[PDB]
Design an enzyme around this catalytic site. Structure first.
Site, PDB file in Angstrom:
ATOM      1  N   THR B  37       0.823  -1.204   0.000  1.00  0.00           N
ATOM      2  CA  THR B  37       0.000   0.000   0.000  1.00  0.00           C
ATOM      3  C   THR B  37       0.862   1.262   0.000  1.00  0.00           C
ATOM      4  OG1 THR B  37      -0.253  -0.026   2.421  1.00  0.00           O
ATOM      5  CG2 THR B  37      -1.934  -1.161   1.189  1.00  0.00           C
ATOM      6  N   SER B  39       0.734   5.985  -0.293  1.00  0.00           N
ATOM      7  CA  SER B  39       0.030   7.211   0.076  1.00  0.00           C
ATOM      8  C   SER B  39      -1.199   7.508  -0.776  1.00  0.00           C
ATOM      9  CB  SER B  39       0.980   8.413   0.036  1.00  0.00           C
ATOM     10  OG  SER B  39       2.105   8.213   0.878  1.00  0.00           O
ATOM     11  N   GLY B  41      -2.707   5.013  -2.829  1.00  0.00           N
ATOM     12  CA  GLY B  41      -3.382   3.801  -3.247  1.00  0.00           C
ATOM     13  C   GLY B  41      -2.680   2.526  -2.841  1.00  0.00           C
ATOM     14  N   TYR B 108       4.777  -8.879 -13.040  1.00  0.00           N
ATOM     15  CA  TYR B 108       4.801  -9.339 -11.652  1.00  0.00           C
ATOM     16  C   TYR B 108       6.127  -9.985 -11.239  1.00  0.00           C
ATOM     17  CZ  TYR B 108       3.534 -12.020  -7.471  1.00  0.00           C
ATOM     18  OH  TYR B 108       3.494 -12.561  -6.211  1.00  0.00           O
ATOM     19  N   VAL B 109       6.784  -9.414 -10.234  1.00  0.00           N
ATOM     20  CA  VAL B 109       8.048  -9.959  -9.744  1.00  0.00           C
ATOM     21  C   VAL B 109       7.753 -10.746  -8.467  1.00  0.00           C
ATOM     22  CG1 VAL B 109      10.449  -9.454  -9.200  1.00  0.00           C
ATOM     23  CG2 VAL B 109       9.138  -7.879 -10.638  1.00  0.00           C
ATOM     24  N   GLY B 112       9.513 -11.214  -4.376  1.00  0.00           N
ATOM     25  CA  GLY B 112       9.385 -10.355  -3.212  1.00  0.00           C
ATOM     26  C   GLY B 112      10.441  -9.262  -3.152  1.00  0.00           C
ATOM     27  N   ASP B 152      14.590   7.219  -5.184  1.00  0.00           N
ATOM     28  CA  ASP B 152      13.991   6.449  -4.107  1.00  0.00           C
ATOM     29  C   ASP B 152      14.586   5.061  -3.969  1.00  0.00           C
ATOM     30  OD1 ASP B 152      12.510   6.257  -1.751  1.00  0.00           O
ATOM     31  OD2 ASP B 152      10.699   5.582  -2.770  1.00  0.00           O
ATOM     32  N   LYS B 154      16.006   1.964  -2.374  1.00  0.00           N
ATOM     33  CA  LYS B 154      15.842   1.310  -1.082  1.00  0.00           C
ATOM     34  C   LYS B 154      15.434  -0.137  -1.332  1.00  0.00           C
ATOM     35  CE  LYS B 154      11.059   2.912  -0.534  1.00  0.00           C
ATOM     36  NZ  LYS B 154      10.180   3.867   0.190  1.00  0.00           N
ATOM     37  N   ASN B 157      12.029  -1.143  -2.702  1.00  0.00           N
ATOM     38  CA  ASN B 157      11.721  -0.891  -4.113  1.00  0.00           C
ATOM     39  C   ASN B 157      12.476  -1.828  -5.039  1.00  0.00           C
ATOM     40  OD1 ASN B 157       9.970   1.151  -3.512  1.00  0.00           O
ATOM     41  ND2 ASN B 157      11.433   2.814  -3.835  1.00  0.00           N
ATOM     42  N   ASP B 170       8.784   1.260  -8.501  1.00  0.00           N
ATOM     43  CA  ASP B 170       8.527   2.547  -7.868  1.00  0.00           C
ATOM     44  C   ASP B 170       9.309   3.744  -8.423  1.00  0.00           C
ATOM     45  OD1 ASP B 170       7.586   4.566  -6.328  1.00  0.00           O
ATOM     46  OD2 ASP B 170       8.167   3.719  -4.398  1.00  0.00           O
ATOM     47  N   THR B 187      13.357   8.635   0.806  1.00  0.00           N
ATOM     48  CA  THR B 187      13.094   7.903   2.041  1.00  0.00           C
ATOM     49  C   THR B 187      14.167   8.348   3.041  1.00  0.00           C
ATOM     50  OG1 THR B 187      12.122   6.043   0.835  1.00  0.00           O
ATOM     51  CG2 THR B 187      12.841   5.573   3.045  1.00  0.00           C
TER      52      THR B 187
HETATM   53  N1  LIG Z   1       6.044  -5.184 -10.390  1.00  0.00           N
HETATM   54  C1  LIG Z   1       5.884  -5.579  -9.104  1.00  0.00           C
HETATM   55  N2  LIG Z   1       5.894  -6.907  -8.765  1.00  0.00           N
HETATM   56  C2  LIG Z   1       5.736  -7.334  -7.483  1.00  0.00           C
HETATM   57  N3  LIG Z   1       5.554  -6.471  -6.453  1.00  0.00           N
HETATM   58  C3  LIG Z   1       5.524  -5.110  -6.661  1.00  0.00           C
HETATM   59  C4  LIG Z   1       5.690  -4.569  -8.032  1.00  0.00           C
HETATM   60  N4  LIG Z   1       5.620  -3.221  -7.939  1.00  0.00           N
HETATM   61  C5  LIG Z   1       5.426  -2.932  -6.632  1.00  0.00           C
HETATM   62  N5  LIG Z   1       5.368  -4.062  -5.872  1.00  0.00           N
HETATM   63  C6  LIG Z   1       5.166  -4.190  -4.397  1.00  0.00           C
HETATM   64  O1  LIG Z   1       4.306  -3.136  -3.963  1.00  0.00           O
HETATM   65  C7  LIG Z   1       4.993  -2.302  -3.008  1.00  0.00           C
HETATM   66  C8  LIG Z   1       4.544  -0.862  -3.169  1.00  0.00           C
HETATM   67  O2  LIG Z   1       4.766  -0.418  -4.515  1.00  0.00           O
HETATM   68  P1  LIG Z   1       5.392   1.044  -4.748  1.00  0.00           P
HETATM   69  O3  LIG Z   1       6.656   1.092  -3.997  1.00  0.00           O
HETATM   70  O4  LIG Z   1       5.453   1.321  -6.217  1.00  0.00           O
HETATM   71  O5  LIG Z   1       4.256   1.967  -4.038  1.00  0.00           O
HETATM   72  P2  LIG Z   1       4.388   3.430  -3.361  1.00  0.00           P
HETATM   73  O6  LIG Z   1       5.279   4.165  -4.269  1.00  0.00           O
HETATM   74  O7  LIG Z   1       3.003   3.944  -3.125  1.00  0.00           O
HETATM   75  C9  LIG Z   1       5.222   3.090  -1.758  1.00  0.00           C
HETATM   76  P3  LIG Z   1       6.486   4.309  -1.233  1.00  0.00           P
HETATM   77  O8  LIG Z   1       6.448   5.513  -2.092  1.00  0.00           O
HETATM   78  O9  LIG Z   1       6.196   4.727   0.185  1.00  0.00           O
HETATM   79  O10 LIG Z   1       7.813   3.631  -1.233  1.00  0.00           O
HETATM   80  C10 LIG Z   1       6.491  -2.573  -3.270  1.00  0.00           C
HETATM   81  O11 LIG Z   1       7.330  -2.202  -2.165  1.00  0.00           O
HETATM   82  C11 LIG Z   1       6.432  -4.046  -3.590  1.00  0.00           C
HETATM   83  O12 LIG Z   1       6.345  -4.831  -2.388  1.00  0.00           O
HETATM   84 MG   LIG Z   2       6.916   5.637  -4.291  1.00  0.00          MG
HETATM   85 MG   LIG Z   3       8.154   2.159  -2.822  1.00  0.00          MG
END
Ligand SMILES: Nc1ncnc2c1ncn2[C@@H]1O[C@H](COP(=O)(O)OP(=O)(O)CP(=O)(O)O)[C@@H](O)[C@H]1O
Ligand SMILES: [Mg+2]
Ligand SMILES: [Mg+2]
Lengths: 20, 336
Positions: B37, B39, B41, B108-109, B112, B152, B154, B157, B170, B187
């Site tokens: 999840t 900020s 969605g 889809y990765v 994890g 970003d 980390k 990501n 991300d 971050t």
């Molecule tokens: N292509 C993919 N395959 C598998 N998991 C994925 C993925 N893209 C994102 N995820 C999973 O979803 C999580 C959240 O995605 P993302 O980091 O893009 O969202 P966000 O940008 O809202 C969180 P933040 O900005 O706080 O780091 C990732 O940390 C990962 O666990």
């Molecule tokens: Mg992000």
């Molecule tokens: Mg992220």
């Protein structure tokens, strides 16, 4: 130890990004 | 490389100038489970009906994005993601929007986040950390050559694919800029001191972040940690870094040149650019071409049982995708 201090801290889980 | 980068640039520019839009719709996917999840969605595992393939669908709430002034960043994220192409960057398969949300459907990765493996295992051996680091080095070299700053970096990501290789996701803060920028984003633990100091910064922040990443992977903890971001920032700006006793002399030397507060001394930001990093003793055993070709022996291959397996991801609270009967923020997201 540094490890033990990190493990007992409040930021060991997933970290959210920040903006603005 | 110069030959390769020149062609990569041409390819990128074409997509950057004429981005793809509306390449699918919501009802073509069955939503299975939330992978994470954010900020604005969440990201969900989904199955494309017609093909049966699984993808990761990132969902963004338009009104929310607009209210929180993140329009530009969101538009950057998609415009950039749809235009890049590299072995260690997750691919955007489809993109579209509806009355209420923006959707980005990525490959889809299943392996994890590097985060979960790192925390579980504790820390990665140097050769293991090095394997991942080389990949990020080549990815930054590629992104930077396109005037792109990632912003970003980390473990959260960084995803591990079925081959044990990294897939960067991300691009929320990715941006195409020639020169400096000022947005306070990223971050906490990975922010370079210039970002925290509001002085304007460039690509160099990605190299500092690489320093933090390598340190975290090898130590099992970040070089600058605390309970509150503000406490973290003080440590980062102080500059003082301490290395675990097990760190090799080479690793410590590389890290001192990456976690360098002095912009005129930070590796990756000098005359030789990325070559200062590629040629460092710590990477002596690294076969750059082999890495790019995905021919190197992966130190670890995540266990996966069938497509659609989410055992490598934590569980999140599910929620219903709401789609208003009225279009929200249409003009703001016209280009999406
Ligand atoms: N292509 C993919 N395959 C598998 N998991 C994925 C993925 N893209 C994102 N995820 C999973 O979803 C999580 C959240 O995605 P993302 O980091 O893009 O969202 P966000 O940008 O809202 C969180 P933040 O900005 O706080 O780091 C990732 O940390 C990962 O666990
Ligand atoms: Mg992000
Ligand atoms: Mg992220």
């Amino acid at each position: 130890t540094t490890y033990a201090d990190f493990i007992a801290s409040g930021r060991t889980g997933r970290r959210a990004s920040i903006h603005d | 490389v110069k030959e390769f980068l020149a062609k990569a640039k041409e390819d990128f520019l074409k997509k950057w100038e004429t981005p793809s839009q509306n390449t699918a719709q919501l009802d073509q996917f069955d939503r299975i489970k939330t992978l994470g999840t954010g900020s604005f969605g969440r990201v969900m595992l989904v199955k494309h009906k017609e093909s049966g393939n699984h993808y990761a669908m990132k969902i963004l709430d338009k009104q929310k994005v607009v209210k929180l002034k993140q329009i530009e960043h969101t538009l950057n994220e998609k415009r950039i993601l749809q235009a890049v192409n590299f072995p260690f960057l997750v691919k955007l398969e489809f993109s579209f929007k509806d009355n209420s949300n923006l959707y980005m459907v990525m490959e889809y990765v299943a392996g994890g986040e590097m985060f979960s493996h790192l925390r579980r295992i504790g820390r990665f051996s140097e050769p293991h950390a090095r394997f991942y680091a080389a990949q990020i080095v080549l990815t930054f070299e590629y992104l930077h050559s396109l005037d792109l700053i990632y912003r970003d970096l980390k473990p959260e990501n960084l995803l591990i694919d079925q081959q044990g290789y990294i897939q960067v996701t991300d691009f929320g803060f990715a941006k195409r800029v020639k020169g400096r920028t000022w947005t306070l984003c990223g971050t906490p633990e990975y922010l370079a001191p210039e970002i925290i100091l509001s002085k304007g910064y460039n690509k160099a922040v990605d190299w500092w972040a690489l320093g933090v990443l390598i340190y975290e992977m090898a130590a099992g903890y970040p070089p600058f940690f605390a309970d509150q971001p503000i406490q973290i920032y003080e440590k980062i700006v102080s500059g003082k870094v301490r290395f675990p006793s097990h760190f090799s002399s080479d690793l410590k030397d590389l890290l001192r040149n990456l976690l360098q507060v002095d912009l005129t001394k930070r590796f990756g930001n000098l005359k030789n650019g990325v070559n200062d990093i590629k040629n460092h003793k710590w990477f002596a055993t690294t076969d750059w071409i082999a890495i790019y070709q995905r021919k190197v022996e992966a130190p670890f291959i995540p266990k996966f049982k069938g497509p659609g397996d989410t055992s490598n991801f934590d569980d999140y609270e599910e929620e219903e995708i709401r789609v208003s009967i009225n279009e929200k923020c249409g003009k703001e997201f016209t280009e999406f």
